Every structure is written in structure tokens, then in C-alpha cells.
Design a binder for this molecule. Structure first.
Ligand SMILES: O=c1ccn([C@@H]2O[C@H](COP(=O)(O)OP(=O)(O)O)[C@@H](O)[C@H]2O)c(=O)[nH]1
Ligand SMILES: O=c1ccn([C@@H]2O[C@H](COP(=O)(O)OP(=O)(O)O)[C@@H](O)[C@H]2O)c(=O)[nH]1
Ligand SMILES: O=c1ccn([C@@H]2O[C@H](COP(=O)(O)OP(=O)(O)O)[C@@H](O)[C@H]2O)c(=O)[nH]1
Ligand SMILES: OC[C@H]1OC=C(O)[C@@H](O)[C@@H]1O
Ligand SMILES: OC[C@H]1OC=C(O)[C@@H](O)[C@@H]1O
Ligand SMILES: [K+]
Ligand SMILES: [K+]
Ligand SMILES: [K+]
Lengths: 781, 781, 163
């Protein structure tokens, strides 16, 4: 039936040459179509699952996403009955024509990682997405089952394994699978007799003779399960055994964590440009991690002192902060230190703060210096290196290569999703955002790392209707630069979802009075309710008795706080039900940041346009997490809500913070918060793209709550439970240390195939990144 | 020898910080040493296998070459007993350090092709160097043996195989090994009944029913052997069967040869800058190749008209030549044409000749234009593409990539060997030679091609004492640009030695009188013996009865004609015995080539310095091979000899020409002629680095010949038999076409592993070659 | 099939090494000595041997180089003279590198192996005269008599040629 499909198509052309999201997609076409739709049926789905249509005049190219991870591309005539199948490169061809006027030059670069990944097969099942360590365990387990050449790497691994001059596991005496099999069995028999609680020092003497070094356990009971696991791996390997053994072998002692950009510190930084949850995340991470490391070290019978170093930039001139000092102890830990190294050039060190978009030229030299410094602090090399965001992941990759260390990366966000069509439009965006440098770093670190941690499933594969953050890096193009035909694969065994949490000492339910910090209420009240207008707070709240609609964030475009302010301003119904309180930007000082500056001006104007004085209180960055905990609980007291109107949010720690304090939450459905909140149960989703519907949705909530206050309680409890179930730090660290064990081993087994990819990546860095980065204009002191 | 060994190192530090070459790095050290040698002990063996030694402060680094293609690097302490093994990358550090003062940036490019080549096992045997098709034959032979997933590709090959819309071998009626097996047997039974001479047309009707298309053979007999061959590969594959069948399948019809630089023509060219044996080789090659292709096509029962196209630059302003016409029939062929295409920029075409060292920025646009043109000429696409030298290989690679055609490359020379230390010292050489472009292209094509042809073993692996031309490319560095850790491997199965020849109608023994061309004797005598001095010839021969010491060649630095002149000028013994005649340079015109100009100035000076008038005749470029043949023969008449005093010579076609006419030849021991000539038997070696001995050797030969004239005749016969045995064109074409058969099929089997290497090279071209080439300044018309 | 199984499989070559390693007759060792425990050493030894031999005149008798070979792990049975010892060592190198059916057959054919042969023909009246035509006594007896004569000649020929 061609009279119909041509209906939609002729409507497609009516739009003119440009990109169209499924946002528009059928919006303009199928629903916006005349009642003649009468479709359902075939070709409705094909269009329903269409992620984007690139429309140029004769043709429209369609990218179709049947399942997460599965993609087919199609060209169909604007006027015709014809439908042809595009190869990914060919569809990327369409995009390039839409922008440059021409497809990229014949011999212009195609990035393809697919042929480099043929080492392990790949899962086709939705269940292994973000689950890759499970798949890997099952592959290793099989590859290991009665293969002498397969088991050897394990023996060599345990044989060479050591820390700070001291030998661990097997000694040099065990040279072959037989001797090992024999020693284990002999050792098993000896211990099987002894009392469970016998300390390793008793049988230490005996073990050393037969070739066993320390780290099997603190006492005989533990050592026995350990030695039995290994006998089991040499006999009949299965995944649970494998994972347990590898996760248990003490490995991680010295950890190195990379976060170069922003002002990274424990006080008076939160909410400055570039300074946000990534800092909050890491500080929570190290503490949870140190606790777990000590625990492990002890259990395996070791006295080793751990060290965790967070490498960031030293900022000499940032005053009111500790950013200018080389070494800083992380609060509430023995072994975690922030290590700070300066950016520098041939001219000497660079003093001023630099935006995260501008740091690229300094990253390589930073890697060199960082290597020297961490090497002065550590005893022995790093056992694990974790990259964070783009610059951190970049540096993390170089260091891991340099030092021969298991690497992990964490994106914390991927700009390509936050700035829609920033890939295809990169050129016009480059003087400002330098996304050519950044998308290069990302693609690079993504493939270079050993394993990857994400905060949610959606960060990888998205949902049924919409594409994930990484998934969107599978096929893209930067016209005039290069074309990524397969840049990453959602099914990659290196992806692991491990969810973060909020420090439970800082954020707890507002209902526990014993724990409420009331010593903060005077300050909070001045902050919320005072009549003073200054750099700390703008306008004033007329009625202190209303519920408060609250948000807190860095102030930039994507965070879209000026959007919220507008939605709020237009809607009389909502302004009547609730006061709007927004924490963002720091007005105490001169903003050096582009987006922030821009956003500040919009805020001012909105205040005048919608005459917001008396309903609205605009607060400066709140840098003390302890008082913030209380602030959230205070919002609860007023029976209000948290709202997060980001155009895109990669994860959203404040969403978790609010829910954890019992504050009912309305969060953007674009990005992580879609997975975090279960609509109508643990909170509500709103669409930043329809803000008036958002404001009405909030007005609705507050109206119901007024009629039936128990409505409020439902959501509050809903959120509280959701957090308890999904996001908390206890499991995280154990999960991470286990992945490091398994991926660490897999490194040596898979070492020979990754050799080509290693060289390919080295060249990409050298001949693509470096030149791009050197083109970025230097900061001038 | 804690005493003795320390002692050599002693002298070593003497020469200071510098390059240590075997001659220097031994001849000085050990022979300028004392009787303290007593060196028939072990340390001398590793000592004399040292190819070069990097002299620095207290360390000296040694590259050691026990056997051809086997290298180990190490560092010894200048004053110390300690010697520590070095990785290839580390050895190359030293060189980088000795020049720039620092190593290359830690993260700057390191090329390693090793991991990309693992597809096949590699021969460790000297015997397989240059023999790789024999090796690939045994790999495929084995991979093929009772493996179904293995045999399918061969069936897909034969089924898909067609030319110009005409099906060949198997039709679509054969979908699987079972039916193929069944059909062949059926065909066999039928054919064995018929008379041997039965033409394919008779049984064609039947063959088409059972799925057999044309190309098995012209008669019953031949069709029978081919069918039996294939049945064999389905049953018991062996290397000989495999090779023979693959060589027999009609494949090569359209052939494209790439030779952009020089003035490429059939007359009024040879001896111009850049115009040389490459032009000669190619013209002979195509003729030989056409005769074989026609042969094959006939034998396999086909009427196809073949085409061979030689692609070169169109030069509109080169007068006296055919170089400005687009299409030129090659003398003595029906199907071979020269196809010229212009260089151009956005500004339009570029008219003026450009030195082979400067062509780089034009090649990519050249490739595009050339694809358009050769597409107009060919009916169907190229079945084979052959690259020639650096530019030709660069373009051939782009083409084969673009058109999906089997690719061969032929180096014809590798400048890195011709210009010692031009890699390490490349930077100061670059404004003139652009070796950064060239070496990049060479490494690029070298790894990109399917198979490589060389003219001699030495060209690949050299000798026991000296390093091969390609081999010298295994590990090197260009400080400040990049470093090649493994760039090529002498044991690579793609290397094939296929030796060229001299056209036998042009060059033949001086003793066959019926054939001598006497009508040229008037001209020749004027050339050598006349008293006129002009741009055609300089100075004069006083005594017409002396033997002549003859050389002919392009005039450039490496050809070292000026060296010969000096050796001759100094040596009174030789001047007395013989007249020196040198053909090189075209003085008829004003030289546009740097080295030529430089070299002319020296020649003039040498004439006056050594007062060469009356013993010396300097002749301008002799451009007609027909008379040239007679020229050689005329030298023989005088009982003279040929001398090739090159500092390095990649092959030496003139050596073959000379030997083929019965002219006793003295050729440089550096490069190819070392293999061509067997000293004392088929000719003599001379060392351009000791020139005075060169002149004495010549002197000795002439002296002995004066005493015993049969000495001359002895060497003459040596040369002739030598040529007869090794270098002739008859075997060449068959060899080439069999290689295409075998490497063509290998393409389809090995396709998946070379996919990784394909991306690596693609990225290397894009990100390394293009930027370099775009930096070479353009010619200005 | 052997040519294939043999191509670049270490595990698959070991059998060949062991074969030539144990091979001996009447207490005298043949081919490889006990000195060679692995393929790398054999590779190296065969290499060294080839090099040494290539220099000596074709007609040089084994005893000359017997001393050296003994040193490096090479026992007798390679050939009578240098020329033949050379060809045989090359064949073996070839099998270690790129095994093919012709080379395998040729090398295994040439290894001195068969010395004592035992032939079974129990029934009939088996003899050289006054037998043929008797019950059960016929072409089989004729066959075996011709057979052994021919065999003996070839065996002597082979034994001599292998040194
Ligand atoms: O003015 C501010 C702005 C942000 N934050 C904290 O910074 C983190 C922001 O993390 P999130 O993931 O929500 O946003 P991000 O900045 O990382 O994109 C949360 O802990 C906030 O409570 C804060 O304490 N004061
Ligand atoms: O003035 C000259 C110089 C060279 N030749 C021919 O050019 C070829 C030179 O090839 P060769 O391999 O000897 O040196 P190349 O120029 O390739 O380095 C030979 O056929 C020579 O006879 C010639 O005919 N006239
Ligand atoms: O009276 C006889 C009968 C048989 N023969 C020989 O016995 C052999 C018979 O062998 P054959 O293969 O013909 O048949 P077989 O007896 O072995 O079944 C031949 O060499 C005959 O010459 C013979 O010499 N005299
Ligand atoms: O850590 C979570 C946040 O961090 C940093 C970002 O840019 C946000 O989009 C994320 O949600
Ligand atoms: O290959 C033919 C000639 O071409 C180019 C050269 O430099 C010579 O050495 C060769 O012999
Ligand atoms: K150990
Ligand atoms: K076919
Ligand atoms: K033996």
C-alpha cells in the first residue's frame, strides 16, 4: 500500500534537509498525520523504532533500532516505493552530506574497532549487557577446562605474583601443573586435620618448604577453601569457583584514581565550574574502597599498608581552597590521599583554572609528571588505575600503558549525548567546546581500558525506546574529521554496571529526629527565608509556610535551571502551591565559565520577566555536604519536592541524595534518572522538552498532597526503598575488587590478541589525539 | 676474556660519539688492535656479526646479526664487564638520543606490524626467504585437508569467478561441496571416453547442464587434467597440486602497472633524470607478460582480449618525447598501452616535470584521476595491479584498496639503503629529498600489498656478512617523527624472487656476426673516436686501439660516475692499459635535476685536475636501446670491460646487459650486483669505498688479458652462462601469473585476519602519509 | 595427512624427534643421539651440521666429519658421503619447517630401517626344487623366492648408501 507510506514521506520532505529525532519522527508524521494513518500493522513498527531520520531532498536515511544493541540502516525514496539497505558506513555518508555538502574524502579515516574485538565471541543476549564479567567468567571457565596450555597462565600468574619484594601464593619451586597439583593436595591434607582457627604462622614453616607463600588466608579454615578452589580450577572449572578464587587472591594494594579537571577538594569547592558529583563520587568511592581493601588484606593473612591516590590538578591561585597543595588526606580515612600535580609547558607551570573543555593540550605532560609523583608516594607500582571522565580516562590509559597496570574507566558522562548533534555539528562547536579532542579521547579510552564501570544499564544500552550513552558511540561521524563505523559495542564483555550511592552518614531520612542536625536551622532559615538580597541569595520568599520546590546543581546549559525557572514562572497554579528555591552558580565571585555566565544572565532576566520576587529564592553554590544533608531534610519538613530538569543527566547523584533523605523527586527522563526512578512509585519522570507539562505535573502532585497528605508519604517511602535496593556503597567496592581480579587475569590470557588493538590505539592517540590537542589554544597567565 | 674483551671496548670509546659501521666498528677496532686478539674464542663471533654500533658516553649499543633475518640488540658498558640485552625499541632509543639528544616523545608513534602478520606461521629457514609462495602453498595445502569450512571458499571462488559478464569454471547450479564433487566425477567419466583433441565446444552443451562453465581447457585432454586436479584438492591437497590448479584457472586479463615519475617513454628518454632501468624493466615486463596471458587464455579455451595498461604522468611540456600524449601503443605488442594522466591541483593541471623526490603531494589526486581513466580504457576491472617504486607502490595500494584487486609491489630500489643514515639523519635531508614521505610510503605499500616481487635474494635478506635491502627496514627510526620496531620481516611469505632479464633481440653475444648491426658502426666510431667536442661528447681519445673501460648510467650521486673518473685519473697503470668512456648526463640541455648538476661540475673539474684529455671520452645520454646493444658489442670488440662503480645499486640491469653481450663486467659489491656476479667466474666485484683497489683490479685484469687473451674469453663465457641460468624473461611471466593465482585465492581465505591490518594501514596513510605529503611544497608553473 | 598434521604443530613433531632419537640397531645408535632432547636443539644442530657440510667437497667420506657430528648429537645413518648427508639433513629441516608429502615420503623412505626381515609361509612344501606343482605349492613359493632376492639387493644398496 504505497499511497500511505508516500503520505508520510512527502511529509518528511516538507520538513527540508536536516536531522530528525524520533522525538519529531512520527510526531510530525504519524500522529500529526491525517486520520488516514489507520495503520498499526507493518511499517509502523519500523518507523516506531526509528532512532533518527536524516532527510535530504531525494532520499531519507533511517537508523532503526529493533532491540538495544541491534541496529539496521535504510535508505528510502522521499517520492518512490523503494527501500534499500545501508551499511553503517553508507548511512554515515548521508550525515556527512547533510553538513559539509559532500561525504568525507575517499581516503579520509574510518575508525573500526570491530575486527580487533574478535578475540572473545560476543554475547547477543540483553542480560549480559553491563554483565560482562559473568560472560567472561563462563568463557574463561570453559577455556580453562582440561587445557594444560590453558591452565599454565594461571600458574605463571600465581607464581610471579608478588608485592613490595615479598612473594605471594606460589613460590619459584612450583614449575608445572603437576608439582602444583601435588603441592595443593599435600597442603590440603595437612590442613584438613588442624583446628579451624589455627593461625597461618603455625603452618607457615611447612608451607614454605613445599612452595606455598602467604595470602591463601589468615587461618587454616580460610586457607583450606582457597587451596580447594584452586584444586577445583585445575580439575573441573566452573564460573562461580573461578570468580570466587580470582576475586579472593589479594591483588589490589596501591590504587591510582585520575580526575584532573575542576577544583577537586573536600571543602569550598562544590558547584564551581566543572566541580560536582564526579568529586562527590570519588571521595565516597575511595573511603568505601579502603575499608574493603583492609578487610581483604587481613582475611588473606597479610600486613600490607594500602595507599589510594587521587591524581588531580594543582591550582596555585584558587583561594579559599586546598587546591594549591600537593598532598591532602581524605577525611575519615587512613590511607587515601589527594595528590596534586601542576599543568605545565616549556614556559613553566600554568597557574589559572582551565575549563574541562580546554585541558587537552596539557594532558600528556601531566601524565609524565603524575607518573613521577605517584611513584614517590607509592611503595611498589599501582595495582589498579581508574580513569574518570574524558581527561581522566585519557590520562588513565597512558599511565596504564606506561606502567603495565590493569585499567578501569568511568565516564561519569559522555558529552556527545549531552550536546545533541555535537558530533555531526562538531566543527561549528569546536572553537568553544573542542569536542574533536574530547570525542577522540573518549573513543580511545573506551577501547583501551580493561574493564568499564557504569552507574546504570541505560548509560550503556539505554531503554527499549531510546539509545544508551555508550550505545550512541557505536556508529557516528565527525564530517571533515573522521568516521567511526564501529566505535564501541553495547555487548562488550568489558562493561559492568556497578551502582554508586550517597554517604549514609550525610544523607538519611528526614524522619529520624535523633540524627537531625538542628544546629544548622538558623543558617538554613536565613538562607531560605531572609529578606536580604545579595550574592548569597536573590529575591525573597513572601510566605514561609508554603512547601518548597527545590533544586541544587552546577549552573550550566544542560543542567537547565533557567528552564525550570521559566516553567515555574509561567504557571500560576504551581507558583500558588509552592515556593521555588534553586541553588546554582556562585555569585560571590566573578564567573570565569562560559555557560555559567550565560545561564546567570538568563536567570536575572527570568526574575524580571515573570516577576518572581516573593515566590522565588535563588541561592549560591552550597559547598558543605553536611549542611546540605540538613537542607534536604528541611525541604522535607515543608512537605515539598526535589526537581531535576536537565536536558540530559548522565547519572544524577542529587536524585539519589533527595530520595535518600525522603524527599519526593521529579527527575528528567533523559539519561540516568530514567532508570533510577520508577515513575509513580519511587518518584516521577518529567520531560525537559515539555516544561509546561512538567510544571502542571508538579502542580498536580502538590494538589493531591494537599487533599491527601499521605500521597506525599507514599512517594517518600517509595524513594527510600528504591535507594536501599539499588544504590549503596557497601556492595560497590567488593564488586570492583572482584572485577580487578578477574580482568587482571584475563589480561594475561587474552594478552596476545589485544596486541593488534593495542598498536592500533597507540597510533590513534599519536596521530589523531596529539595533533588535535596541540591545536587547542593554551591558557595565558 | 675479562682482560681481552675490556680491551676492544677500550679502543671503541676512542672514536667518540658517532655511528659505528661494521667496517669501521671492526676494521678499526680489531685489526688496529694487537696480537692480544687470541680471538678464536667466542667473543669474536658475536663481535664480527655486529652490523652497527652506537657510540655514546659510557654505553655503546650493538645491533647483532648472527644469520640473515635474525637480529639481537644489546648494550655493553664502555668501562665495565656488564652487557645487557636490548629490546628493538630500546636500541632505537640510542639512535634517537645520539641525534636529537633525547629519545622520541614517550607517547609518539611506534610502528609494529608484527602482530598484524600472525595469520600464517613464519618460516625460520633461509631457504624460504624469497620463496614464500612455496610456504603459503603448504599452509593452504594443509589448511585444506579434509576441512569443509576450509574448502567452501575455493568453491565460492570458482562459482563467483567470471569476466566481462561471462561465467567461468563453476555455474550457480553448484551450491555445495557435495554437488561439486558429484559433478566433477560425472564430467571426468564423460571426458575420459572422448578423443584427446576433442574441442571444448563438442562437450560444452553437456558441461552446461551439469554446471560447468568455460575455462577448464581448450580440448578434452586439458579439461580432464584440470578436473582431476580439483578433485585432488577436494580429496588429498598437496602443495604442487594446489599451485598448479590455481595457476591454471584463467584469472589475469586486465593488468594495471603504476609508474608515475620520470619521463616514461619508448624513445628520447633514457638517461634523463629519474628515467632508467625502471622504464626498461616495465616495457620488457609487459611484452613478456602479454605473450603469456594470450597463451593462458587460449589454453583454457577462451577468446578474451587482454589489456595491460602502464599508468604514468602526462607531461605536456616535454619536447622531443611522446610524454604528452594520453595513450601510446607499446612497441611489439597488440594489447599493451601506456596511459598518461596529468598531475593537478585545485588550480588545474601541472605541466612541468617534477623530481621523483617531490611528487608526493600529487599522488592521491593522481590515484583518483587514474581510476577514472583506466576505467574508461578497461572492459571490466583490473585483475592485477602492480606497483613500481615508491610512488607507484603508494598509488598501487590506494587503487587496489579502492577497486578490490590483487596487488603486487616491486621496489626497484629502496632509497633508505642508497642513502646511508638517511633515516636517522632524515631531518636535515628533508627539504631536499622528503624521505619522511618516501619511507612512509615504502613501509605503507610494503605491508599493504598481497605479494612482493624482488630481483634477487640480496634485495630481501642480503648476505651472511651484510644486511638486505628490505631487511634494513625491519627496525629503524626517524628521530622526531616516528620509530619502526618491526616494519617488515625478511621471512614474510609474500616475498618472491622473480628475476628479470635483458631483451634478447636487443642484447646478444658480440660474437654472432650475422646479427651485429653494422650500419651503426659509422655513428659509434664518431661517438667514441671523433675529435669533435660538444654537448654530445667531451674530450677525445688519442689512441683508438686501446681497450675501452665502459660505463653507461643516469648521472647522479649514488651512481658515482665521478668516483670512477677519479679512480681512473689517479691510476697510471690503468690509464696506460685502457681508455675510459662514460655515458651519463644529457648535456644537450640545461639540467633541471640537482644531483645531475652537482655531478656535472665534478666531471668537468676531474677532467682538468687529472688532465684526462686523450684518455677519456664523456658521452651524453644514449637513448636508443637498439644502438645501445651494438655499443656494448663494440666495446667487446676492443676487448674492454664494463664497470659499475655505484656506491649502492639495487639491481643493475646494465650489468645484465653487459654480461649478455659478452662484456666482462666489474660491478659494485654494494646491493644487487653482489648476487648477480660470481667473482672470478661470471665477473668481478669491486668496492666503491676502496676505489684505488678498484682501479688496480681493473689494471690487473687488463694486464692479464694482454698476457693471456683467453682470460678475457673465460670471463665473457662466465657472464653469458650466468645470465642464461638466472636472469631471463621467459620464466618470469609464468611465475608472475601463478603468483597472482595463488595470492588471489589466499586473499579470500585470509581475508578476516588481514582486516585488522587493513585498518591499521588505512589509519597510517590517512594520519601519517597525507599530512606529510601535503607539506611538500608544490611545483610552480 | 601426515604432511598436514605435521605442519606447524610442535606436539605433532615430537613423535618424529623421538622416533629418530630411539632409533638404533644392534646396540649402535643411529640418526640422532640421546643428546638432543627437544626441537629447538635439533633445529640448531641440523643447522650447524648443514653449514659445516656445505663447505666440504661432495665426495668427502662420512668418517671425516664423524668426529664433529658425534659431538653435536649426530649418529650414523645419514649417508655414506658428505653429498648424501647433506641432502638428508636438508630434508629433515624441511620437515620441521614446511612438511610436504614428497619430502616426508622421501625422508622416511631413506632412513635406514629394515635390516632383519621375517617372512611367513607355513603351509605347502616350500623349497627351491622338486616341489612346484605339489598340493598347496605354487606361485606363492615362486613369489617369495623372487621377492627376497630382489629385497636383499635393495637392502644392501640402501645400507651402503646410508653409511
Ligand atoms: O551547589 C552545589 C551543587 C552540587 N552539589 C553536589 O554536587 C553533586 C552533584 O552531582 P550530580 O551527579 O547530581 O550532578 P553533576 O554535577 O555530577 O553533574 C551532588 O552531590 C550535589 O549535592 C553541591 O553540594 N552544591
Ligand atoms: O644514458 C643511458 C643511461 C641508462 N640507459 C639504460 O637504462 C637502464 C638503467 O637501468 P639500471 O638498472 O642499470 O640503473 P637504474 O637507472 O635503474 O638505477 C639500462 O637498461 C641502461 O642501458 C640508457 O639506455 N642510456
Ligand atoms: O607343475 C607346475 C605347476 C606350477 N609351476 C609354477 O607355479 C607357479 C604358479 O603360480 P600362479 O600364480 O600361476 O598360480 P598359483 O599356483 O600361485 O595359485 C608358476 O610360477 C608356475 O610356473 C611349475 O613350475 N610347475
Ligand atoms: O556523577 C554523575 C554526574 O557527574 C557528571 C555529569 O556531567 C553528570 O551528567 C552526571 O550525572
Ligand atoms: O629494476 C630495474 C632498475 O630500476 C631502478 C634501479 O635503481 C636499478 O637498480 C634497477 O635495476
Ligand atoms: K608468587
Ligand atoms: K563462475
Ligand atoms: K638414535
Amino acid at each position: 500500500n504505497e499511497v500511505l507510506a508516500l503520505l508520510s514521506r512527502v511529509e518528511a520532505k516538507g520538513k527540508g534537509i536536516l536531522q530528525q529525532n524520533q522525538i519529531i519522527a512520527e510526531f510530525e508524521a504519524l500522529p500529526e498525520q491525517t486520520r488516514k494513518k489507520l495503520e498499526g500493522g507493518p511499517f509502523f513498527d519500523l518507523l516506531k523504532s526509528t532512532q533518527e531520520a536524516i532527510v535530504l531532498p531525494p532520499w531519507v536515511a533511517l537508523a532503526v533500532r529493533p532491540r538495544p544493541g541491534v541496529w539496521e540502516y535504510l535508505r528510502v525514496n522521499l517520492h518512490a516505493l523503494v527501500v534499500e539497505e545501508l551499511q553503517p558506513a553508507e548511512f554515515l555518508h548521508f550525515k556527512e552530506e547533510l553538513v559539509d555538502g559532500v561525504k568525507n574524502g575517499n581516503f579520509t579515516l574510518e575508525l573500526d574497532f570491530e575486527p580487533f574485538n574478535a578475540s572473545i565471541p560476543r554475547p547477543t543476549l540483553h542480560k549480559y549487557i553491563g554483565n560482562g564479567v559473568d560472560f567472561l567468567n563462563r568463557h574463561l571457565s570453559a577455556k580453562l577446562f582440561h587445557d594444560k596450555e590453558s591452565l599454565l597462565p594461571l600458574l605463571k600468574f600465581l607464581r610471579l605474583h608478588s608485592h613490595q619484594g615479598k612473594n605471594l601464593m606460589l613460590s619459584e619451586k612450583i614449575q608445572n601443573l603437576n608439582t602444583l597439583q601435588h603441592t595443593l593436595r599435600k597442603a590440603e591434607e595437612y590442613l584438613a586435620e588442624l583446628k579451624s582457627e589455627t593461625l597461618y604462622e603455625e603452618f607457615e614453616a611447612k608451607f614454605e618448604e613445599i612452595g606455598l607463600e602467604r595470602g591463601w588466608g589468615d587461618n587454616a579454615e580460610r586457607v583450606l577453601d582457597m587451596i580447594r578452589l584452586l584444586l577445583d580450577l585445575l580439575e573441573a572449572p566452573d564460573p562461580c569457583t573461578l570468580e570466587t578464587f580470582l576475586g579472593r587472591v589479594p591483588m589490589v594494594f596501591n590504587v591510582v584514581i585520575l580526575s584532573p579537571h575542576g577544583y577537586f577538594a573536600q571543602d569550598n569547592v562544590l558547584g564551581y565550574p566543572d566541580t560536582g558529583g564526579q568529586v562527590v563520587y570519588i571521595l565516597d568511592q575511595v573511603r568505601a574502597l579502603e575499608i574493603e581493601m583492609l578487610q581483604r588484606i587481613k582475611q588473606q593473612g597479610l600486613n600490607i599498608k594500602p595507599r589510594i591516590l587521587i591524581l588531580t590538578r594543582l591550582l596555585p591561585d584558587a583561594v579559599g581552597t586546598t587546591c594549591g597543595e600537593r598532598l591532602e588526606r581524605v577525611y575519615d580515612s587512613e590511607y587515601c590521599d589527594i595528590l596534586r600535580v601542576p599543568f605545565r609547558t616549556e614556559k613553566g607551570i600554568v597557574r589559572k583554572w582551565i575549563s574541562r573543555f580546554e585541558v587537552w593540550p596539557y594532558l600528556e605532560t601531566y601524565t609524565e609528571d603524575a607518573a613521577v609523583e605517584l611513584s614517590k608516594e607509592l611503595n611498589g607500582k599501582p595495582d589498579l588505575i581508574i580513569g574518570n571522565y574524558s581527561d581522566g580516562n585519557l590520562v588513565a590509559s597512558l599511565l596504564a600503558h606506561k606502567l603495565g597496570v590493569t585499567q578501569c574507566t568511568i565516564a561519569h558522562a559522555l558529552e556527545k549525548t549531552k550536546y545533541p548533534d555535537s558530533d555531526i555539528y562538531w566543527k561549528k562547536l569546536d572553537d568553544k567546546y573542542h569536542f574533536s579532542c574530547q570525542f577522540t579521547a573518549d573513543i580511545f579510552a573506551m577501547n583501551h581500558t580493561d574493564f568499564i564501570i557504569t552507574s546504570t544499564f541505560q548509560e550503556i544500552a539505554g531503554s527499549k525506546e531510546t539509545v544508551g550513552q555508550y550505545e550512541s558511540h557505536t556508529a557516528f561521524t565527525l564530517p571533515g574529521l573522521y568516521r567511526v563505523v564501529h566505535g564501541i559495542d553495547v555487548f562488550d564483555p568489558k562493561f559492568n554496571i556497578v551502582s554508586p550511592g550517597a554517604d549514609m552518614s550525610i544523607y538519611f531520612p528526614y524522619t529520624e529526629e535523633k540524627r537531625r542536625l538542628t544546629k544548622f536551622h538558623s543558617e538554613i532559615e536565613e538562607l531560605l527565608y531572609s529578606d536580604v538580597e545579595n550574592k548569597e541569595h536573590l529575591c525573597v520568599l513572601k510566605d514561609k509556610k508554603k512547601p518548597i520546590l527545590f533544586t541544587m546543581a552546577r549552573l550550566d546549559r544542560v543542567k537547565n535551571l533557567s528552564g525550570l525557572v521559566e516553567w515555574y514562572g509561567k504557571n500560576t497554579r504551581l507558583r500558588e502551591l509552592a515556593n521555588l528555591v534553586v541553588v546554582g552558580g556562585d555569585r560571590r565571585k566573578e564567573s570565569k565559565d562560559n555557560e555559567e555566565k550565560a545561564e546567570m544572565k538568563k536567570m536575572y532576566d527570568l526574575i524580571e520577566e515573570y516577576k518572581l520576587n516573593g515566590q522565588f529564592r535563588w541561592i549560591s553554590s552550597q559547598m558543605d555536604r553536611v549542611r546540605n544533608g540538613e537542607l534536604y531534610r528541611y525541604i522535607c519538613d515543608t512537605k515539598g519536592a526535589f526537581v531535576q530538569p536537565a536536558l540530559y543527566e548522565a547519572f544524577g547523584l542529587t536524585v539519589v541524595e533527595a530520595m535518600t533523605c525522603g524527599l519526593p523527586t521529579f527527575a528528567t527522563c533523559k539519561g540516568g534518572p530514567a532508570e533510577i526512578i520508577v515513575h509513580g512509585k519511587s518518584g516521577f519522570h518529567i520531560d525537559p522538552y515539555h516544561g509546561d507539562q512538567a510544571a502542571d505535573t508538579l502542580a498536580d502532585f502538590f494538589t493531591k498532597c494537599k487533599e491527601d497528605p499521605s500521597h506525599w508519604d507514599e512517594i517518600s517511602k517509595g524513594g527510600l526503598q528504591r535507594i536501599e535496593e539499588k544504590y549503596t556503597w557497601q556492595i560497590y567496592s567488593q564488586r570492583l575488587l572482584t572485577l580487578t581480579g578477574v580482568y587482571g587475569f584475563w589480561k594475561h590470557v587474552s594478552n596476545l590478541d589485544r596486541l593488534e588493538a593495542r598498536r592500533y590505539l597507540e597510533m590513534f592517540y599519536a596521530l589523531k589525539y596529539r595533533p588535535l590537542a596541540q591545536a587547542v589554544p593554551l591558557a595565558q597567565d
